[PDB]
Amino acid sequence: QANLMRLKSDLFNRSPMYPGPTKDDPLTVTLGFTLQDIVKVDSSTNEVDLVYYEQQRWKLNSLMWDPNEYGNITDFRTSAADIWTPDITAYSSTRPVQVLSPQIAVVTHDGSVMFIPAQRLSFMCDPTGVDSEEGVTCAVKFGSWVYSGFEIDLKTDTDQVDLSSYYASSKYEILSATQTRQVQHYSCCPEPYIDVNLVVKFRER
Amino acid sequence: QANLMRLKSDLFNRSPMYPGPTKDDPLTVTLGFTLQDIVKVDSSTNEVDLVYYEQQRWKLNSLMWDPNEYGNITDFRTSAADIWTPDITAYSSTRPVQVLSPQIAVVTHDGSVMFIPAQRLSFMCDPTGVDSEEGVTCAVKFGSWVYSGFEIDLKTDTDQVDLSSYYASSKYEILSATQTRQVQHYSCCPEPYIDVNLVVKFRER
């Protein structure tokens, strides 16, 4: 439409692309997971696959506008390729992550960007104990590939992994599923480091 | 082709890209399937693979023209990447969907776009009972990835999955194949949500 087509144009084709966070201007990023299923286990290789949705939230001053100057538009969706996006990455993966959906975000007049692609991840996990009462735990830290806590502030809004889409006929049952954020201070180093630790305790149904 | 090239030149190359639908300017997208075969059933992982043609239809003012100004040309074929196409996707895929054909659309002088590519889709399904005489039911729902019922109005013309092309020597027998639209009203949320639920009930032939 008229104004949206104008809005997007002013936000994207006018200014240079956000160059990323810095210690003088730390960016807060909120992360959460919606676990759909544990689609694979492999005891011959100690590999585990998940299928879940991954949301990430951040706010950028450069993506701000006056709605009144743009036909009262409060927000819009756009290709995630049109914006800057974080490097929140799994740290102990065994394969290249697969995207199971489009990558489209939502920018809000105040600057909020939200983004939730579907993913399949293969990570390191010895699953011996899966076929049993007590089950087995699998942990996989998530954090930024290259920013310390001084530049990107990784936060979760709840320590609890969303299991409301966890498959009814999945071969496994979630004994527990947490997304706890830890902030590490290393005696070696002045800057802090943040990871969000995905811990999933589960067994064969 | 001088007439045709000039037309395409005027539509695509001269007017900003359709920025997608809004609450202010909604869009009806019609979706339907043609199931060819159920190609993989995996009891150990719980995934099913289907090959089918996926049909998508919508109309845009941005894409209408007067045949008289373009030598009576009423409709043309151009590749889907030349146009805006919706984000209708399977909310439960376990692998990136695989395109099995060229993606080319037919644009009409009235703004009607149609697009029917073939696809291999792996999704979540517990197939216990496929050997049985009663079969097994697998379900996957399709919907916009980023749009609500207020921006994308998703429908079907028939609740029947078209089985006129089903592979005659399939290892499987289709007991029923439906593509039913569902409108969701959540207690939490003002805006409605629409999925087109693809349900196939089948057994070994």
Partner: peptide
């Protein structure tokens, strides 16, 4: 549920 679908999660981040 709302939180079981992508477009609803985009519209209701905290509300999920």
């Amino acid at each position: 549920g709302c939180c079981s679908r992508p477009p609803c999660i985009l519209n209701n981040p905290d509300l999920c």
